[model samples]
Target chain A: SCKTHVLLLVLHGGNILDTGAGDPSCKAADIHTFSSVLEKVTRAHFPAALGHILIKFVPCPAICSEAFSLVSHLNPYSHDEGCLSSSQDHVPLAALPLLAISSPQYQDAVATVIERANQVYREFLKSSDGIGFSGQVCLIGDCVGGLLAFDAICYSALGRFDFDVSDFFLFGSPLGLVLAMRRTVLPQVRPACSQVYSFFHCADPSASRLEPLLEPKFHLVPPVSVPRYQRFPLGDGQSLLLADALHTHSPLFLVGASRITAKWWGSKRIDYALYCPDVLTAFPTVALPHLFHASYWESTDVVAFILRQVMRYE
Target chain B: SCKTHVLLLVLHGGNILDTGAGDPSCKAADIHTFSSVLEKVTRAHFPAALGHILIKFVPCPAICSEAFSLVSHLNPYSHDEGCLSSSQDHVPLAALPLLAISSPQYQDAVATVIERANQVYREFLKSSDGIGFSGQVCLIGDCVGGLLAFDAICYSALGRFDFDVSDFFLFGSPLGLVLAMRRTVLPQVRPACSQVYSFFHCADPSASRLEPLLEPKFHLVPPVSVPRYQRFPLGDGQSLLLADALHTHSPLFLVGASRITAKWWGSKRIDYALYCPDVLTAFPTVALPHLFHASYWESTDVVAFILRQVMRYE
Candidate 1:
């Protein structure tokens, strides 16, 4: 028996712009195939729930030219970069913190998409919408979209959008960029919206950098349900600033566990311990099967397997 | 003898309005104390090269009441909840993208502050008129400012500003939000900058779940540095689709290293190995850090130690 109903939302990141797929310089047709495969895999899981998947499209102007060139060169079957347009005047946006652009308008664009999407989502989220699952929203995104999944909830919660955002399944995320650049500001995003889950591959070059934020202050010292705004290191000798601890650390591999698991992980226990730079209690071994790059889509069955585990236990 | 003259430009992320030694939350004294630790551990290495350490102040309304309370409760002695202001209106303003926010006469109270801040930064940049390293700009930022550092460059390169931006060092940045959320409809802001050596961390909780624009494509691929208009996956499957990898297979550990390095480490004999995924070669790593949430400031001695080893040439 399924516990509740979940709305699947897939948000695109940067580089997937029109030129990336089926282009000469930046072939990315696998992305289209993945989307098609996603529809297929999703239907296999919830044939009835197939209609629930909402894919949000994010355009990428930053890396379009090369994507086009690659698509044109590598793609053999066809040559249609799927991006909507090519406005060289388009602004370049960052996906971490989702709020770090120099222009506030860009942030508003994020807010607008989320707001509009939720408006549509709310139409299907009535109490009697079907199963007893009260309606859970799950986000699955790539690159910028992974970071955007994080940002969407924050924006939705902050902006008061009409959607119950439940879980996030981010893949091959630039979890590192978000962790490193937006270290301290992350506390405000969570506690407001509880369900945030991430997946990354260690061997993946982009995924390896999300390490430091897994520390105690950001993930451990503070309660997940409660929001604390401690400005990190109080004195000059502050070795592990909570912001740095949380921001620099990538929540990789731990797909099902809550922030609590990371809270009490290993060396993190040192804060509870009496030793300086205290010895860790539990050593976190990397789980098997390095799911690097776009392997998540290839192994959606496995991801669905892991997510089901989390859904069951968590 | 340090040869190059460098001017450090420090930027702040969300929830940090002021680091003035006087403000109770981020008192100048607190920053001084923070700087002292940084100086002793890290910045000391730059010596003659480090001209001046700058702090950029950007505003964000996401600092919820809960955040203020958390800070107040955690740092009872210093955290002044009173110093925090909740801008219900500001929230909307912050969510807007640069183009939307930059429209003619968009002078709401929120815009007023944003405009004022931009002016302040512009003036600050101009203040270094006579500095010896006037041509050289080294940036450092935490959280949202981290995104600012990256976007500042992209925008500068696109001719959005009136500065010659160069050599960036973003800390725990969220540069992906703007690109991901806005899709491809971004207005060019600045157009003369690119990254030299940028650093970021993602330790904070909110860092991961802010918007829907920051995730990796289809689980494994991080957003490539390709132009944004072409082959954009619209949703989450861009990079991986291009690379033709799968989702659940994102390797968040060691197996995802490229062939070049794998052969170097004697892990493989061929240019492309058997076990490795095909996308491995498509998406290569660049200057981004390998660790997730690194501490660049206090961990100065760590780098110093690495430098010592490098100078010794193994």
Candidate 2:
């Protein structure tokens, strides 16, 4: 008899932070696609764990006015007429990293999201039978939302907020961007969280820019831990850098697994990988990046990875 | 009787980590110079706090053999004859950054140092009477030793060890280097410590190289918090980039302060500064970088900055 309650909080990346629950203006297509894939993934591999998993989308707070003001000072392009207009629904992708820096307004905004998420968690605990709550909170976010996942766990470590985050699954998230801009480590605020996993396509421009800044010397050599199949071009037994490997963010191409390992003040392997290939016939190149951004939920490999992590601990 | 015992643990940069106390071959000249200047600074301004402050030097562990092995793999220059020679008294300046990246051996080495340091702290607390320990420990280090200091505080946060670290005065420390290499934030493991101050000379190549990776756009504009007098170059009230402003590592030149302010996930202003004076009148140009590495203790401005941090909290 296992007692495990996995509360899965999914944060959508890009401008969706401006979207909230029941707000018809929120991108229903995006949320629907992510939730549908997650449900299928859980049903297929983690049937039992699925029952215990609660999913919630954290909304972006109205601090965009202040956040964009700061962003305008740093990068002018982020300020657009659409974002400034109160009637607009979509948030710009650039705004995501700026929000992740943990400003005063951003801090309170994130707190409200967690607080609301915990309400659902507690309610689930109250209704469940003999199952004991493991306090294992799995935070999953895509793109800029993934940066939120990074900051949320860090903020919790700072005791800025209390979140029992156990696992992080970030897809095409710009944590590398956050690290480069902030010039600081996200600090292992939640040591209890066994995995701080990030997934990206080698072709993704967002991920490639961060490849060098993350490990400068590894620009030439492959990371220490790589799955054997992907370790081709083995003159020195090293694979190509992320910048050289993949060129499209489409899910069809992101089907394979490659891991980048480094020492985070420990011998433990922290992995970064990109992979793919299946059905580009169904989609076009023009929408590849957007499809790739939304594709993590549909990918069997990505789902399998998450399932393994859940099973490993559960 | 304030009963506040401020134990200042000074970690010497570069080769000193390999050396220990009472070793005749240990750099006596360096320690004497640093200690003498520290004493003078305290006597002149922080006389009352001086009565409460106790200073100690943290030694590097003997993980040099394994640590350097990995270093050799990354950079060949680090595997020089002087460092590999067991009979030699001095540690190589290059061996410092390699040791900063936590390997299995280096991790244990730093742990041993922190463990040993704690014993001394306990004994001091036990013997002193009518002296209240403020539970405030200031971790001061230069160059590579600064990396050790960063690791020490982070370790304490990880519950690997316990140290109530209050302030960090890192002079010309390559924490930016460590962050670039490791791809992680130094994580605010110790929120209790008020100031995590880093000092550098803009001209110092070691600090300047990191200035770009730390925050890319700031490559053009001067850091956000340039000292008021140094703020003159700003047409719209901004200063020169760290790379553009200063170019030497000599302590003789780094007599002023220029601040870089960035948000690290909270409202807290994490400060990074670079500064300088006219020229190296006392020393030749060839030896300026070396003197800069060893110069923090003697610099009146640097010492004054440390004193102000100590007194502010007291």
Candidate 3:
């Protein structure tokens, strides 16, 4: 079948379930367990009869500290090697042999996965088999998977691939170091506060503001956290417009509400002030307990959100 | 009394009211009035309490038709001088040796004049006495005055002795050859976008986005004009939060709504936008009255917006 549209790309956060530490079994169980949860949740949440959609998990291993570095290390020195390797990049990632270290066959492997996914999308486009009918690609991830989202965006910039992708959503993610990593990728890949939405619990140490000190001083602007949200009160002292928007949608969410250290992954509840109608008013956080991280078996809604943002359905 | 806080800095736009011909001057009764309408509109619009602010205006003439010739003419090399001619700059208004320019000794005589406005600011700062406040300043201007705002900010970046004042406000300014002019004036000075809040009406030809394209691109993350404000309502909203708190209260305003031909200036409501709001929104067909070309007074609001985005107030 001729491909009418591309499929949505679903991304999973790295180490969403297990904190990467010395414990052997605990460190290893996260990948598959998270993968299984994603499968089950997406199936239950979305209407499968509508049509069809493509969902895939972005891999995160306990040994994978930085995706860019890992990809660079895995790249074979002569394009004839196999699998991957692990070594941290203290110097510039560009200085290392990224494409050289990876095997020549790796490109085909990645291409096939994308081609098969496109094949499924083509089938849906011909027969209207999925909930969504437009070409919208999104990168959704949690924890370390958030790091991959950053990598993918940078990769798109370097390769200059003008894909029809929409939003890139990250949940329960560490922003401080992640944004710093983005700076190293492309200087012109300037992301405004509104362009990239970040959520942090006030209590999460990793939720601190992205400082420019991590990169060279000659970048376009200084790094400082500024509050853009305006929480003006609603009529009759009932509620506020900005406050409601924040409580209602993840798009307006702020991170690090907690005063101290907190657990690895927990989704924020949609406060009462978000939407007007009851249908849209339902709090997904309360309805789905295993969410906020991409460990669940179901992620169609999250994937849909990403596709809708980066690429318009039309 | 100990000097508490410094006041505002006002910039004037180019050639009074005349947009036709090469020299800037609009005649009401067959008289060549050396000054323009910048100061009149400023006093009429902005509150009088802003008197403490440093007020200055610089000439920005439109020699668009003769720009190529202007450079070619200046190409004459004198073996005695080692460089071109003994001239400071190509434009006479921008040249420092003009006679009868505004002077600190006679503020009342040249109150409405653009040429000596900076002298007014310097004089005020020398004798002013006030409460113990941190040095804070704001700018407002039209036309040539508006273009001077960029010049002044560039001057401040070079650590000019007189301009200890902080904050800038300019409107309808150009983003062309002046950047090259600045590069020559202060080799060590950096661009001021990071310390300024830059605002532009996307459709205004007078409001050029090419300011970022200037040589010695500074490490400032100022936003370029996006197509639709609806998609991003805040209007370079991210810069507001990231900018220093000192600039929070004072704002720089830039307005660019012109309908006249390139040869000269025309009368319109465009000049009012400069002093109308703390933040001005503009579009095409918005007529600019005070400006003929890219400048300081006419573009004061835009400069003010940029300065507010970049600098930190006490």
Candidate 4:
């Protein structure tokens, strides 16, 4: 069956959920379920598109979960080995590994994920028992996988693999840190991708600002949180006009709001508070980055954002 | 009359209100009214303190208002001259001059403001016919004046001038960028000051994060907004228990709040939304940085925060 569109979600769970390189799973099925919920929610806002759009969750290879000290704790003369050691960073615990992700090992990790992605693309097209897919290819990556998806679309053209990189969505990603690395002080959006969006929980420690990396002064601009899916005008009278919209939707929009960067840097850092929207302010442990990362897969704000982009693609 | 405690608030208004260097008009009285309202509001929370505690407003000297280019436009072979060329910044319109605040002219400006501040301090103490006022000196700087207040307290001790630096409040300050220059990469709170607080509206284009400059990774942590003054427990049996507190005040507290940086960097970046709680998100013109800067003076959240710090001092 030829598909009108294919949405390839290449997701990488957080290091906490990772099962080390060469080993996959433990959380892959959980990611699958999260993606399913995402599609379920997206369908409400975008009904017709899902009819022929194939949504696939491509689980990227994982990172080492434990045995941080086992690798290089006792190295005779260590240069850069056992990085998984806990709290060595005066930096946020989440940022320790994030700052180091630009290293050779992680570089190879991002590259392999990219190569594996093309293989997945080639194979999905080869044996899916369908005519050459006529639709766009959307790349959605989370955590370490988002980095791979970034370069996947950034370095390679979507057409080279016979796909249109129509939309790219990143969830709870630290791609900002990767870009901040000297490798590329600032990255421009590849001309091929139609649109790009990055989503992070307000408290996602792994999330950094791409805008600030591009322009240090943008640090002043707060990333506006994604509006609820219900706020958008759905068709068939579900969509409300401005008069009715104010009466029914988030009244905070009249005020108590946020802002964006000065430059349109090919992507936006879309912030969302805990949209599952629970947990106390005092307990830092409950709202974990992995938890926030996982929450994005099930997030209406995130899915609605992707749907918005896909709508523009058509 | 002798007072046991005095909180002399030395405040600087936004540049928009700045009526050149010498003419201290105009908004100084508006600032006085704002301070009066602040005292009225604080009395509701801390009634007893006002009876003996004197609250004085010290308006700093004004800034150059419209003649940004008049002085420097014709300066031949200028390497670094007119900074106030509207929107010349690839930096945010707000940041254009923020990046340049470290210049010698601004340095002199800050110093002059500081000298005028000490003058105000001396006059208030000597002529008031009060027996050596035993109180704290609170430096409250707004807009460009925040830079002045920053160095005012940062360089001079609270006791050096025989005043306990009980609190230092900064509103919509770009002190982050100021510290960012090679001059001082990071600033530590002076030991003489009991507490420090910095507040900025979430939409204030002039506001930047001090935490990020201290530690780049801290950028991931969102500044926790000052919980509404009403959230705090008031006396007279109005105080609610923890369980009851959760049930009533901002049940969004059950979830959907915010976070702080990894380390306690001497002070906190307290964020607040359009707290007048008006203005549409689409209109950037309405929620101007100066407006946000001015809003802090009238903010219940800001005053309540000050009251809390004063409580600790006692």
lDDT by residue (tens digit), candidate 3, A1-314: 32324343444434422323335443235445544443444354433312333544434332232223222222211121222222110111211111111223323333433444355445555564443455555544454445444544443212221344444545545443433322322233432111343433221212222212222110112111212112221112322122242344333224432311121111211111111123322332112112333222233333333223333243
What shift in Å separates residue A255 of candidate 4 from its native position after superposition?
31
Interface RMSD of 3: 25.9
Maximum-TM-score candidate: 4
Write one digit per residue (lDDT tens) for candidate 3, span B195-258. 3333333222233222223211111222333222223222345433322221332232112112
Q: Please give the TM-score that candidate 2 achieves against the real structure.
A: 0.38
Best by DockQ: 1
Each prediction's Cα lDDT score?
0.34, 0.47, 0.31, 0.48
Candidate 1, Cα interface RMSD: 16.7
lDDT per residue for candidate 1 within A1-314, as digits (tens), equals: 33345555555544223223333222144346555655665565546445543443333222233323221221111113332112111112122223333234445546655665666555544434434445456556665555545555552123754655555555555444443334333322342243444443322223312222442133223221111112211112323233334444445223324453434222211111011111221111111112243455554533333234233323
Clashes of 4: 1
Clashes of 2: 26
Worst 10 residues of 4 chain A by lDDT: A69-78
TM-score of 1: 0.32
Model 2: per-residue Cα lDDT over B1-314, one tens digit each: 54545667776545323333334335346666776766786786577766666676765444334433332232211123223322111112223343435444556656776676677666766766324555577877766666666677662212333566667777766565445334322221333355566676643423422333434433333333434222332112322233234333324224232322331211222335545564632443224445567656566556555565565466
Cα TM-score per model: 0.32, 0.38, 0.26, 0.41
How large is the i-RMS for each model, in angstroms? 16.7, 15.4, 25.9, 17.9
Worst 10 residues of 3 chain B by lDDT: B260-269
Segments of candidate 4 deviating more than 4 angstroms: A16-27, A63-91, A128-130, A155-164, A183-192, A230-276, A280-283, B1-314
Look at candidate 4 and give me any clashing residue pairs: A20-A63
